[PDB]
Design a protein around this ligand. Structure first.
Ligand SMILES: COCCOCCOc1cc([C@H](C(=O)N2C[C@H](O)C[C@H]2C(=O)N[C@@H](C)c2ccc(-c3scnc3C)cc2)C(C)C)on1
Lengths: 148, 88, 103
């Protein structure tokens, strides 16, 4: 309802640059605020995209849903093309906290059913199970906009 | 002072820039003192924590392509516990 | 160009950065500012190779490609113990426990 694309109907050509070692999942927030997944981008690859002014995009790891940055921020909004020159959407790894990075590595090695078999504190078991999720992040970003 | 000393459970002394150690909220509190002893963090974990501080300070607020922070599977569990205690 | 290092001696490890164009002698001045030992009482190594004071860190093999923030390059250090230099000794870090069955 709040975080949604504006139906401008004004085309905007964008280049999605995956400057990360992850397979990227571009996510478009439709006119109702629903995340719509788009075809994945392999690690060093770029893609020319036809989008519109005022549309909202976010990018995640396709396999784990780990958060990624686009032009050093969470959301990408295609702007006006000056001279038909496309807008760059530089998709990079954020500087994850060492804790989050450790959670990522552990999640990648152990099956979710065996998280409870790990010899760690109960709060860390819950942290492993609280895997990254687009809907949760959208709720978080919506809450942070109200504070402003 | 300019540098601080972080001592592992097995006695290894790691001398890092004060600004880099302040990345950890736990260390920041323990200092505010120029040395900190970690009776639960071994050297193979604490060395990686110091490498993380360098990585974080170098790549935060930077447009240069950020590389992946590598974590060997063998160190992942202990490093997770250490990161959780250190709040970093 | 910055180069990221671990200057190691016995159970001591200094995490610092330096320019690729900076010299081995200039690195000894950095060690002096930390461990309070003058350059004449220091020997710096790359593996078993003794490094010459006038050589740049780049010339000694410490480049941006090999001395990364997340994987710093190791520089060995030995002090002069009463006019005779000690042998280069670097205590290894602890061994990680055996990988759990779940991994
Ligand atoms: C010119 O005025 C039009 C008036 O019509 C009224 C305004 O139209 C429109 C049209 C649209 C949407 C739309 O089209 N969008 C949404 C994003 O903005 C993107 C765009 C879109 O789907 N582009 C296509 C071409 C496309 C883009 C990227 C890829 C990817 S992503 C990774 N690898 C690939 C290959 C694939 C396909 C549709 C509802 C889907 O919203 N409003």
């Amino acid at each position: 309802p709040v975080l949604r694309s504006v139906n401008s109907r004004e085309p905007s050509q964008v280049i999605f640059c995956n400057r990360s070692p992850r397979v990227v999942l571009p996510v478009w927030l439709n006119f109702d605020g629903e995340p719509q997944p788009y075809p994945t981008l392999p690690p060093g690859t770029g893609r020319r995209i036809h989008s519109y002014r005022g549309h909202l995009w976010l990018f995640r790891d396709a396999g784990t849903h780990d958060g990624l940055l686009v032009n050093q921020t969470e959301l990408f909004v295609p702007s006006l093309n000056v001279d038909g020159q496309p807008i760059f959407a530089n998709i990079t790894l954020p500087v994850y906290t060492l804790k989050e990075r450790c959670l990522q590595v552990v999640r990648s090695l152990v099956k979710p059913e065996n998280y409870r078999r790990l010899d760690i504190v109960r709060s860390l078991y819950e942290d492993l199970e609280d895997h990254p999720n687009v809907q949760k992040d959208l709720e978080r970003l919506t809450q942070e906009r109200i504070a402003h | 002072m300019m540098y601080v000393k972080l001592i592992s459970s097995d006695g290894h002394e790691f001398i890092v820039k004060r600004e880099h150690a302040l990345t950890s909220g736990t260390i920041k509190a323990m200092l505010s003192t120029n040395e900190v002893n970690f009776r639960e963090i071994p050297s193979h974990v604490l060395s990686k924590v110091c490498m993380y501080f360098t990585y974080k300070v170098r790549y935060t607020n930077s447009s240069t392509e950020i590389p992946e922070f590598p974590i060997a599977p063998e160190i992942a569990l202990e490093l997770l516990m250490a990161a959780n205690f250190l709040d970093c | 160009m910055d180069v990221f290092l671990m200057i190691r001696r016995h159970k001591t490890t200094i995490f610092t950065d330096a320019k690729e164009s900076s010299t081995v002698f200039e690195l000894k001045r950095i060690v002096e500012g930390i461990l309070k030992r003058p350059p004449d009482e220091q020997r710096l190594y790359k593996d078993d190779q003794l490094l010459d004071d006038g050589k740049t860190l780049g010339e000694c093999g410490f480049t941006s490609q090999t001395a990364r923030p997340q994987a710093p390059a190791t520089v060995g250090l030995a002090f002069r113990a009463d006019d005779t230099f000690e042998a280069l000794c670097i205590e290894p870090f602890s061994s990680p426990p055996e990988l759990p069955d779940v991994m």
